């Protein structure tokens, strides 16, 4: 009931209100919004957002949220987490995770590693990569002017001079996901931030610089690491391996808080494994690079300084491999302390899969929950915590169809050539949350060249999932006069649904069939948290049937549904899948 001359901002409303204003109307949210200094952007991605608007999609209700960036909070995060003083282990538990070392280790390259060059270093570098404290230039500025200082610091460190090791803490800038929280009542508006922790982008690239092998784990050598394959063929050589078993089981590992529990021996184990790849000239680097971290010097973004007891700052450079192989020598470990099973039998009556403190091991059945059992308390000698759960044990799979991994689960695919396979999957309002508000920070603003980018690039990643296919499809429908956006995940050079062939190895129109139940799993937090109505389905079909009827070869035809309703199939043409800010 408000007045006339008033009614003029109500056309420009985009979602429902979010004030909770008991005695005052709250008509709706724009979608514009004040950035951090003065400027007015948009929230999420137009083009992509627009769409899921056009179908029951309120982007207001996606399980998404900023992160509390601001100093209270933060403090009371680097006190709640990082706080705390070194995990005891059990005696022996370092000897024992170096024998199982050397039980995986790759006498091929023992001793081989060495320094790299500048160019391979720089390869897709992050520029942008934050810069210290006491220190002006970043990354990229760095390489330009105080080049040569990385030099000398990587000649310091080899000499084993003296060094000022510190690290500089700040709460990271990012929305999260609370589809976990809302699901359950509580309706967060916002959550703790992740604190970061990062050695000066001078250290970081001296760092990186001689042990970019084993940093960027170029020749993986760490057992089960898969950060370094790509997510849309993943599953299905975890498939392989579970259909080998007779009647397989996969236990799924949950630190609490790895990098908060990584102690000081842990650092120094790697400083060993280190050492075993590197060539000798290059010990007193490693060790004397790995003496530094075992109690770090802290300045807080604030300007607060903590002398910091060995952990992980998950700014250094050795983070992923260092907590990937230390992650892995520890479960491996426990699995052996459970079971009964010998160390050097481990790959035999089991196999394992990490992705930095995240994994899981397949085994026989009874294995696994005999690993399941003993394996917390193991573990929390270990010095490596389990999260406490309610059936006070490990998370077991039964089916492979419930392995949770890297943040996703398989999901089933039938070929139009009645074969199948296994696609990463994940939940759709998570799919969607991501795809409505994941704007080019490595830029700024918005084109429909960059959003035609982002759809492609979740193309390749959630084909799987038609309502996203579909919105994908229907952005890259746009501006077919513009090449894609390199700011992206991935990108496209000449047809994009060629592409998708150039690396799903097959074609779009014959993606046949989604499963059904890990679908309909998939699909629950749309319906539960609002997010979608019952027309959203039908609305977005009709989208793309509209496009695709008229006369021509219609990108929105691959969609085997929307090909069917329309009489039209798509001709695919050239397409090469190509990288652009992909980690």
């Known amino acids: 009931v408000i007045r006339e001359h008033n009614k003029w901002i109500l ?8 004030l909770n204003t008991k005695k005052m109307l709250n008509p709706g949210k724009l979608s514009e919004q004040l950035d951090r200094e003065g400027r007015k952007r948009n929230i999420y991605n137009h083009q992509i957002g627009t769409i899921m608007s056009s179908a029951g999609i309120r982007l207001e209700k996606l399980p998404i949220v900023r992160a509390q960036t601001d100093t209270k909070t933060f403090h009371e995060a680097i006190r709640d987490k990082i706080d705390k003083s070194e995990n005891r282990q059990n005696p022996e538990l370092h000897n024992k995770l170096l024998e199982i070392f050397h039980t995986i280790a790759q006498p091929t390259l023992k001793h081989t590693y060495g320094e790299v060059t500048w160019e391979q270093l720089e390869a897709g570098v992050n520029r942008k990569g934050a810069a210290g404290f006491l220190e002006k230039k970043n990354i990229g500025e760095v390489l330009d002017s105080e080049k040569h200082l990385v030099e000398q610091l990587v000649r310091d460190l080899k000499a084993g001079r003296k060094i000022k090791y510190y690290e500089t803490a700040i709460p990271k800038n990012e929305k999260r996901d609370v589809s976990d929280d809302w699901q359950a009542g509580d ?29 960027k784990q170029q020749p ?13 063929n993943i599953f299905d050589k975890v498939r392989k391996e579970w259909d080998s078993f007779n009647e397989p089981v996969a236990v799924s590992f949950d630190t609490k808080a790895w990098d908060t529990q990584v102690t000081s021996k842990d650092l120094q184990l790697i400083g060993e494994i280190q050492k075993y790849y590197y060539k000798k000239e290059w010990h007193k680097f490693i060790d004397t690079i790995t003496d530094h971290m075992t109690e770090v010097p802290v300045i807080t973004a604030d300007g607060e300084v903590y002398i910091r007891n060995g952990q992980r700052g998950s700014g250094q450079p050795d983070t992923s491999a260092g907590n990937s192989m230390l992650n892995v020598l520890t479960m491996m470990y426990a699995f052996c302390e459970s079971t009964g099973v010998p160390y050097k039998s481990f790959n035999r009556v089991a196999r394992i899969h990490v992705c930095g403190d995240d994994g899981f091991l397949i085994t026989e059945k009874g294995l696994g929950l005999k690993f399941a059992n003993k394996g917390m308390q193991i573990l929390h000698e270990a010095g490596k915590p389990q999260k406490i759960t309610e059936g006070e044990k490990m998370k077991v799979a039964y089916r492979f169809e419930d392995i949770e ?11 139009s050539d009645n074969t199948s396979s ?4 994940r939940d759709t309002a998570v799919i969607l949350s991501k795809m409505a508000t994941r704007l080019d920070s490595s830029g700024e603003r918005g084109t429909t060249a960059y959003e035609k980018a982002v759809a492609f690039s979740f193309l390749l990643m959630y084909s799987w999932n038609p309502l996203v296919r579909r919105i994908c499809l229907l952005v890259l429908s746009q501006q077919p ?15 994009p649904i060629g592409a998708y ?32 109505t019952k027309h959203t389905s039908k609305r977005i079909i009709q989208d793309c049937v509209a496009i695709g009827k008229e006369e021509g070869n219609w990108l929105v035809k691959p969609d085997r549904l929307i090909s069917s309703k329309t009489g039209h199939l798509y001709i695919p043409d050239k397409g090469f899948t190509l990288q652009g800010k992909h980690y």
């Open 220 to 232: 993986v050598v760490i057992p089960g690491y898969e950060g370094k394959t790509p997510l849309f």
């Open 187 to 215: 309706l967060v508006v916002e959550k703790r931030p992740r604190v970061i922790q990062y050695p000066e982008a001078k250290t970081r690239l001296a760092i990186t610089k001689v042990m970019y092998n084993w940093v």
């Open 481 to 495: 006069e513009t090449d894609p956006s390199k700011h992206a995940t991935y990108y496209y050079k000449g047809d």
């Open 405 to 415: 991994f890297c943040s996703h689960t398989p999901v089933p695919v039938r070929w």
């Open 11 to 18: 056309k420009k409303i985009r979602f429902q209100g979010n």
């Open 501 to 532: 062939k150039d690396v799903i190895g097959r074609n779009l129109s014959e993606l046949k069939r989604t499963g059904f139940e890990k679908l309909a799993n998939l699909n629950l937090s749309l319906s539960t948290l609002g997010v979608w």
């Open 422 to 425: 296994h696609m990463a999957g």
